[PDB]
Design a protein around this motif. Structure first.
Motif, PDB file in Angstrom:
ATOM      1  N   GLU A  43       0.819  -1.209   0.000  1.00 47.62           N
ATOM      2  CA  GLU A  43       0.000   0.000   0.000  1.00 47.62           C
ATOM      3  C   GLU A  43       0.853   1.260   0.000  1.00 47.62           C
ATOM      4  OE1 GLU A  43      -2.813  -0.171   3.161  1.00 47.62           O
ATOM      5  OE2 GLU A  43      -3.700  -2.065   2.493  1.00 47.62           O
ATOM      6  N   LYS A  44       1.793   1.362   0.942  1.00 47.35           N
ATOM      7  CA  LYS A  44       2.537   2.607   1.098  1.00 47.35           C
ATOM      8  C   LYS A  44       3.205   2.999  -0.209  1.00 47.35           C
ATOM      9  CE  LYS A  44       4.531   6.002   3.320  1.00 47.35           C
ATOM     10  NZ  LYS A  44       3.756   7.245   3.552  1.00 47.35           N
ATOM     11  N   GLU A  45       3.973   2.076  -0.793  1.00 48.01           N
ATOM     12  CA  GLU A  45       4.639   2.366  -2.053  1.00 48.01           C
ATOM     13  C   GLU A  45       3.626   2.832  -3.085  1.00 48.01           C
ATOM     14  OE1 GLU A  45       6.937  -0.978  -3.296  1.00 48.01           O
ATOM     15  OE2 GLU A  45       8.354  -0.822  -1.627  1.00 48.01           O
ATOM     16  N   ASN A  46       2.484   2.145  -3.162  1.00 40.54           N
ATOM     17  CA  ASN A  46       1.468   2.515  -4.135  1.00 40.54           C
ATOM     18  C   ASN A  46       1.069   3.973  -3.969  1.00 40.54           C
ATOM     19  OD1 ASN A  46      -0.937   1.986  -6.038  1.00 40.54           O
ATOM     20  ND2 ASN A  46      -1.960   2.588  -4.134  1.00 40.54           N
ATOM     21  N   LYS A  47       0.778   4.396  -2.735  1.00 43.85           N
ATOM     22  CA  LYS A  47       0.364   5.781  -2.539  1.00 43.85           C
ATOM     23  C   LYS A  47       1.446   6.726  -3.029  1.00 43.85           C
ATOM     24  CE  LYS A  47      -1.662   3.778   1.513  1.00 43.85           C
ATOM     25  NZ  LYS A  47      -1.081   3.120   2.716  1.00 43.85           N
ATOM     26  N   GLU A  48       2.707   6.388  -2.765  1.00 44.21           N
ATOM     27  CA  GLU A  48       3.797   7.202  -3.282  1.00 44.21           C
ATOM     28  C   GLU A  48       3.842   7.143  -4.801  1.00 44.21           C
ATOM     29  OE1 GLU A  48       7.220   5.712  -1.273  1.00 44.21           O
ATOM     30  OE2 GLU A  48       6.763   6.759   0.604  1.00 44.21           O
ATOM     31  N   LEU A  49       3.738   5.939  -5.371  1.00 43.63           N
ATOM     32  CA  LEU A  49       3.991   5.789  -6.802  1.00 43.63           C
ATOM     33  C   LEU A  49       3.034   6.642  -7.619  1.00 43.63           C
ATOM     34  CD1 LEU A  49       4.602   1.963  -6.756  1.00 43.63           C
ATOM     35  CD2 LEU A  49       6.205   3.584  -7.787  1.00 43.63           C
ATOM     36  N   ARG A  50       1.731   6.536  -7.350  1.00 48.82           N
ATOM     37  CA  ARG A  50       0.784   7.323  -8.131  1.00 48.82           C
ATOM     38  C   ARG A  50       1.092   8.807  -7.993  1.00 48.82           C
ATOM     39  NH1 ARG A  50      -4.039   4.848  -9.569  1.00 48.82           N
ATOM     40  NH2 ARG A  50      -4.151   6.645 -10.982  1.00 48.82           N
ATOM     41  N   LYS A  51       1.500   9.239  -6.799  1.00 48.76           N
ATOM     42  CA  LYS A  51       1.839  10.644  -6.620  1.00 48.76           C
ATOM     43  C   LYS A  51       2.986  11.028  -7.537  1.00 48.76           C
ATOM     44  CE  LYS A  51       3.373  13.987  -3.141  1.00 48.76           C
ATOM     45  NZ  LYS A  51       3.747  14.191  -1.716  1.00 48.76           N
ATOM     46  N   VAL A  53       3.677   9.607 -10.300  1.00 48.24           N
ATOM     47  CA  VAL A  53       3.132   9.610 -11.652  1.00 48.24           C
ATOM     48  C   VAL A  53       2.447  10.938 -11.932  1.00 48.24           C
ATOM     49  CG1 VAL A  53       1.325   8.618 -13.096  1.00 48.24           C
ATOM     50  CG2 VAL A  53       2.960   7.119 -11.919  1.00 48.24           C
ATOM     51  N   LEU A  54       1.808  11.520 -10.916  1.00 49.80           N
ATOM     52  CA  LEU A  54       1.255  12.855 -11.089  1.00 49.80           C
ATOM     53  C   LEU A  54       2.361  13.903 -11.106  1.00 49.80           C
ATOM     54  CD1 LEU A  54      -1.865  13.264 -11.387  1.00 49.80           C
ATOM     55  CD2 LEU A  54      -1.215  11.102 -10.308  1.00 49.80           C
ATOM     56  N   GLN A  55       3.322  13.797 -10.186  1.00 53.81           N
ATOM     57  CA  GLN A  55       4.417  14.759 -10.152  1.00 53.81           C
ATOM     58  C   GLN A  55       5.253  14.682 -11.424  1.00 53.81           C
ATOM     59  OE1 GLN A  55       5.700  15.543  -5.554  1.00 53.81           O
ATOM     60  NE2 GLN A  55       5.959  13.438  -6.290  1.00 53.81           N
ATOM     61  N   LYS A  56       5.374  13.486 -12.005  1.00 55.01           N
ATOM     62  CA  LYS A  56       6.100  13.351 -13.263  1.00 55.01           C
ATOM     63  C   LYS A  56       5.447  14.165 -14.371  1.00 55.01           C
ATOM     64  CE  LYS A  56       5.208  10.249 -16.169  1.00 55.01           C
ATOM     65  NZ  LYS A  56       4.334  10.151 -17.371  1.00 55.01           N
ATOM     66  N   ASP A  57       4.141  14.426 -14.269  1.00 56.09           N
ATOM     67  CA  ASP A  57       3.508  15.341 -15.213  1.00 56.09           C
ATOM     68  C   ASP A  57       4.138  16.725 -15.131  1.00 56.09           C
ATOM     69  OD1 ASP A  57       1.560  15.914 -17.231  1.00 56.09           O
ATOM     70  OD2 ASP A  57       0.352  16.943 -15.716  1.00 56.09           O
ATOM     71  N   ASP A  58       4.391  17.204 -13.912  1.00 56.21           N
ATOM     72  CA  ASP A  58       5.004  18.516 -13.736  1.00 56.21           C
ATOM     73  C   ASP A  58       6.429  18.548 -14.281  1.00 56.21           C
ATOM     74  OD1 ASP A  58       2.726  19.606 -12.547  1.00 56.21           O
ATOM     75  OD2 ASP A  58       3.327  18.947 -10.542  1.00 56.21           O
ATOM     76  N   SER A 150      -7.003  11.512  -3.194  1.00 60.31           N
ATOM     77  CA  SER A 150      -7.263  11.239  -4.600  1.00 60.31           C
ATOM     78  C   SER A 150      -6.114  11.773  -5.442  1.00 60.31           C
ATOM     79  CB  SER A 150      -8.584  11.866  -5.062  1.00 60.31           C
ATOM     80  OG  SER A 150      -8.813  11.617  -6.437  1.00 60.31           O
ATOM     81  N   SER A 151      -5.793  11.044  -6.511  1.00 60.30           N
ATOM     82  CA  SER A 151      -4.769  11.465  -7.457  1.00 60.30           C
ATOM     83  C   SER A 151      -5.307  12.384  -8.546  1.00 60.30           C
ATOM     84  CB  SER A 151      -4.124  10.239  -8.107  1.00 60.30           C
ATOM     85  OG  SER A 151      -5.058   9.542  -8.913  1.00 60.30           O
ATOM     86  N   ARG A 152      -6.622  12.576  -8.625  1.00 66.08           N
ATOM     87  CA  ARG A 152      -7.213  13.389  -9.678  1.00 66.08           C
ATOM     88  C   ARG A 152      -7.038  14.871  -9.377  1.00 66.08           C
ATOM     89  NH1 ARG A 152     -13.513  13.189 -12.030  1.00 66.08           N
ATOM     90  NH2 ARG A 152     -13.273  15.051 -13.340  1.00 66.08           N
ATOM     91  N   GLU A 153      -6.613  15.627 -10.385  1.00 71.14           N
ATOM     92  CA  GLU A 153      -6.586  17.079 -10.325  1.00 71.14           C
ATOM     93  C   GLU A 153      -7.811  17.627 -11.040  1.00 71.14           C
ATOM     94  OE1 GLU A 153      -2.935  18.537 -11.910  1.00 71.14           O
ATOM     95  OE2 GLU A 153      -1.700  17.724 -10.288  1.00 71.14           O
TER      96      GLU A 153
END
Lengths: 766, 766
Positions: A43-51, A53-58, A150-153
């Protein structure tokens, strides 16, 4: 044969393995060996990973620093304080902004206009205005919103994303309410970013009410207050008291709550809503100058501001509302006649004032509170060291686990207690339970006869009736109490220095329940009836050894009753002459009378030891007459009581003298000599009863150790499982450990991290 | 006025007067007032003697020829023989005429023609007689019938009374038959008188069947014949055989039973029936004439007769049937072909032959059997006086009433048991139930403390738990068991040689039902729970004598547990060495190991007299491995149990030394300066439990003597009423000779009294 349940459990456990091991080895241990590793990995890694993936957009640069706006990071700071301790006692540590006002006064529109978007749902005007939301406000290059969970912006300039944002909030809003009440405290955390937005964190709290109607619960009025008071208590909060400008200021409902946390409005700000609808005020200085200067209220605020919250349309766009707000004040009389000052109107001025106060106090407050919560870890470490030697091995749940294992280990050891000890307990208890019937009903009436056949006949009649009716029931009671008492002893023994008090609470709760879930098999009463008879049935003392064992038991049983009778007689008759002159133990009148009556009965028995227990009534009269003639007052009741004790003493002591003669009586029966008084038949009775006590104790032990003790182990395991599932029992039992104090020392590490990183970011931005 | 005898008497008078006007007595008066009228107003009519005068006239001078008829007395004679013995044997002693016949042969029509009245069940083609009916015929101008068991006289000249009589006979016949069956032996007795009747007892019998018809129950076939035999076998009786002569004689069955019962025709009279029907349906010669001649069957007869029974119509009168008889026998085959004898046909000839043979047989047999019945009454005297010389003609109902009085008196005597007796039993039992727990659970852990506050805390923990959940439950068990046991003892234990055991069975039967119906009151457990607590809660010893009694009670408890511990030690460690030289009696190997362990443990206690009661695992191991070094083979359980015994010996001997110390100063206890100074919490503990036990015993005694004993008396009266209701419950044990012998004596006296007048009338009247 000694024990059978464990063999059955092992057998069927092995059968279950033989049939399902190709699945059970995978499910039970293979994956579980790594289970402790899984929790971090999954779980923990997952919460980081998606973040990421969003930060990689920036596409941020490495080692740039200034990764996030400071306030967006302070939102995490406040969130971690809320998670660690949601009570106001911990909220008080850091700055907040409270958004409170009259129900449906437009306060939600005030917050949304400050946030520069219609971010909160406004589906209805009754239940949707009486529930909390929290939103952080941050500077940004684009108006975008993101949830904690949520990971959605969300694009704040488009209707679709604002609608989805309001929908997520609403999904949380319409559920975080007590049924009927429609108002409950709960946390919903959204981060709203964009150009022109300030460094704040605003909490929209349930709208305040003064009355309750048929569509709402009566408690609703109080619950709101309880929520409303909770965040107002924060001494570091800026409280926006938002009042509906269309109603009298004297009739404000929220004010009467704000005065309970800030009686003079020192840390509060006044907000006037619906300015473009409350024409009666905005057009008249006599109301507005008092309302906005702080003369119409008891509250002396940090500031006073007027805003436009919408023209009665709960769903009107925030952008249009702000454009109309800027247009209205210019249109209105208020600017021309200086009833409201230019810095007291519109969203911009309110936002900037509250932002400046809040963010300055935030900078200093976190610089303070990082060390505050780190100091709290140091304070938690002094208490924890002092209370116990440094140790964190135990836990509240582990207390249940350890007491469970202690109980099951003691129950097993109980099952493997040396059986011989079980029979000893059962035998002594059985003798104590039965001696009353043995001597008072069986021996006492039987051995007064002048025929051994009548002794045995009386004995055997009483024994048949007794072995069929009472004796088996008494034996079953003895066995039940023996098992339950030994179980209690194993559950409670204060084993010197090896005893642990902490577990005791569970030992008592289980001990009670485990006993009630066990029952002794009643059929024993019938089995014992047969078994007991058999032990008695042996009336044949074939040799000297059993003759001596028989005489021993007869002597013991009769000596106990003789000593009891002698103590009663000594109290009844009084001291001897030696006592009367050496220790001046003078007799009472009753004692003297009893002594003389005893002397009468005793001369009778000395002259004739064969006299039976029962006298004639005229004999009672004769005794009274002689005692009266010598000068002793006596009545039939005194004679009957004295007679009972005296004759029993004579009977038992004669029996023991007959023991003394039996010890050396065998020739008489070889010769059949006619002048021989001695016949030693009581010996057989007490031999039989000794052996019957042994047989009953042993049968009860066997039933205990092969049938009932394993059932008890099963019942104890069931009770322990039921108590393990019971959270309340763990809460109210096994509470003694100091681990609770250490849990705070370890948990405040998230607050410590957020605050220190925020301090570093504060330095980087400066 | 207090403690004044006269004042007590006056108070008792007032209390008794209020009970005299109790609702029980008031309801008794109200119900009695109606009862004085219910089943009343008969008495005033009863006083008249006119009915008695008529009965006297019947008995003495009835001024009519019917008076003092000897056959009339014979009817009573046979009735009293039936009363003496249901079994046939004695009824067979005296002559009667027994009439058997083929089923539906018309036998009741024959008996009606002989009785000259429609007094027998008449029907077409159906079983008419199903239970035998004995009608006695005597001369008299009044043609009237009367039942043995009733007062209604039936006028035999009028159809209403004749039909009522027939249907009452039918109902009685049915009432003699068990449900589901059709035939029964019980004999109905009707005394019929009228002009032209002969001196003839006539017994109608269930009709005999070759085979059961489908509609009829099978039972009858076995039943019918047996019943017939019962009456047919009478060696002093005439057999009147009624055979259907209008059917194929091969189908008849009565003649076989007649031949069985009278192989020689010694008193056999044969009759054919349905002769008028036989005219057109004559039984063929080849089977009927061989019956008339006694050749087809062994049956011989005094004469072969025939009568007509009608044409199958059930309402035919006597005169009609007789007329048809005369026509038939004038014109038909029964005479023209010489089967039957002319002087043996028609109703009158059969009636006269039966009367003559009957009364000659009566004169010859009744005198012999009447002398034999004088002999019979003396014979009953012979056995009876030997059986019950002291008591004559005792009955089981009388015995029940006597037992009821004795048992209720025994309950009252139970109320008379002295209060101290009840309290002593209760307290001794109560102390037996706790003392082991007192030392094991309280004293041992409490007395090992270094702080007497924890001693008293252990005391209070155990005592409060027991009081809350145990003591009020043990006390009620003790008390109700005590009441049950003493109730049993008063009812069974003989008071010497004067005891009468006649009602012991009834006492035992009452005991269990009364105890089961009775309960100990529920409230007790709560009051005890409070009372016991308070007795403990008071911790202050009021005086020196009480302090000394506390020390004596403590010494009893501590000495008992010390001797038990010492005996258990000797059991595990085995003989002494001095015992080896003295009796050659040594340690067993296990006992050798136990003693070596004991010696090492005693060395430990010598070095440290304050060692805690529990050996830790390291202490146990030190003992184990030191003994292993000695070569003794020791394990942790051996040492744990040996240590428990040795340590408790040490501890209890120290406790008795403290018993001796505590005598001098209760004040030293009050000082509580230091452990070396007297610390006598032990004496106050045993005092507190002294109070608890004594008060529990007295409370139980009080409820017993003022609440439960009177409830017991009420329940016993109810149970003895249930005894009154059931006679079987009086003869549950089959020792019933008393009642049966009394009844037989009285009935034999009646038999002989009637036979004496009958025989004198034979001498005079004839």
């Amino acid at each position: 044969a000694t024990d059978r349940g464990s063999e059955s459990d092992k057998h069927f456990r092995k059968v279950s393995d033989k049939e399902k091991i190709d699945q059970l080895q995978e499910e039970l241990l293979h994956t579980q060996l790594k289970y402790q590793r899984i929790l971090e990995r999954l779980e923990k890694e997952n919460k980081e990973l998606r973040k990421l993936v969003l930060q990689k957009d920036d596409k941020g640069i490495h080692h740039r620093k200034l990764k996030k706006s400071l306030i967006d990071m302070y939102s995490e700071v406040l969130d971690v304080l809320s998670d660690y301790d949601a009570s106001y006692n911990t909220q008080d540590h850091l700055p907040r902004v409270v958004v409170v006002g009259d129900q449906s006064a437009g306060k939600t529109s005030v917050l949304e206009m400050i946030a520069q978007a219609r971010i909160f749902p406004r589906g209805s005007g009754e239940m949707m205005t009486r529930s909390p939301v929290k939103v952080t406000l941050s500077e940004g290059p684009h108006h975008v919103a993101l949830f904690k969970d949520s990971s959605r912006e969300f694009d704040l300039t488009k209707e679709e994303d604002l609608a989805a944002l309001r929908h997520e909030i609403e999904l949380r809003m319409r559920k975080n309410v007590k049924e009927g009440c429609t108002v409950s405290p709960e946390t919903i955390s959204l981060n709203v970013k964009g150009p022109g937005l300030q460094r704040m964190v605003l909490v929209d709290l349930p709208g305040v009410i003064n009355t309750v109607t048929s569509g709402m619960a009566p408690d609703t009025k109080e619950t709101i207050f309880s929520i409303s008071k909770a965040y107002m208590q924060n001494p570091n909060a800026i409280i926006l008291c938002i009042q509906d400008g269309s109603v009298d200021a004297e009739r404000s409902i929220v004010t009467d709550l704000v005065s309970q946390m800030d009686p003079h409005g020192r840390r509060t700000i006044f907000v006037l809503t619906k300015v473009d609808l409350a024409e009666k005020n905005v057009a008249s200085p006599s109301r507005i100058q008092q309302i906005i200067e702080g003369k119409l209220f008891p509250m002396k605020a940090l500031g006073y501001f007027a805003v436009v919250t919408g023209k009665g349309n709960s769903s009107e766009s925030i952008e249009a509302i702000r454009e109309y707000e800027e247009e209205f004040f210019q249109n209105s009389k208020l600017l021309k006649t200086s009833m409201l000052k230019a810095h007291q109107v519109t969203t911009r001025n309110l936002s900037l004032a509250v932002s400046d106060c809040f963010w300055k106090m935030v900078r200093e407050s976190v610089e303070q509170q990082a060390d505050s919560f780190k100091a709290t870890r140091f304070n938690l470490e002094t208490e924890w060291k002092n209370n116990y030697p440094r140790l964190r091995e135990l836990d509240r749940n582990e207390l249940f686990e350890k007491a469970k294992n202690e109980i099951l280990d003691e129950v097993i050891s109980l099952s493997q207690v040396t059986p011989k000890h079980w029979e000893e307990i059962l035998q002594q208890s059985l003798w104590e339970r039965v001696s009353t019937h043995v001597i008072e009903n069986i021996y006492l009436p039987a051995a007064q006869t002048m025929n051994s056949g009548t002794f045995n006949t009386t004995v055997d009649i009483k024994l048949k009736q007794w072995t069929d009716k009472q004796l088996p029931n008494k034996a079953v009671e003895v066995a039940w109490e023996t098992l339950q008492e030994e179980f209690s002893r194993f559950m409670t023994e204060p084993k010197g220095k090896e005893h642990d008090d902490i577990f005791d609470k569970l030992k008592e709760a289980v001990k009670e329940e485990s006993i009630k879930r066990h029952k002794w098999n009643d059929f024993a009463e019938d089995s014992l009836r047969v078994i007991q008879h058999n032990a008695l049935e042996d009336r044949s003392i074939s040799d000297k050894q059993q003759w001596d064992a028989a005489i021993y038991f007869m002597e013991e049983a009769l000596q106990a009753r003789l000593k009891d009778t002698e103590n009663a007689i000594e109290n009844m008759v009084g001291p001897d002459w030696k006592k009367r002159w050496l220790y001046w133990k003078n007799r009472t009148q009753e004692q003297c009378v009893h002594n003389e009556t005893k002397n009468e009965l005793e001369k009778m028995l000395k002259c004739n030891e064969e006299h039976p227990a029962y006298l004639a009534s005229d004999e009672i009269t004769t005794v009274r007459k002689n005692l009266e003639s010598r000068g002793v007052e006596v009545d039939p009741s005194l004679i009957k009581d004295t007679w009972h004790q005296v004759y029993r003493r004579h009977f038992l002591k004669t029996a023991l003298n007959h023991c003394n003669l039996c010890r050396r009586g065998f020739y008489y029966y070889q010769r059949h000599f006619v002048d021989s008084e001695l016949e030693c038949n009581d010996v057989v009775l007490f031999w039989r009863i000794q052996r019957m006590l042994a047989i009953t104790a042993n049968t009860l032990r066997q039933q205990l150790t092969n049938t009932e003790v394993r059932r008890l182990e099963k019942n104890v395991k069931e009770v322990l499982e039921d108590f393990a599932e019971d959270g309340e029992k763990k809460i109210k039992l096994l509470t003694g450990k100091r681990v609770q104090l250490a849990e705070d020392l370890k948990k405040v590490r998230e607050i410590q991290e957020k605050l220190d990183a925020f301090i570093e970011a504060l330095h980087q931005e400066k």
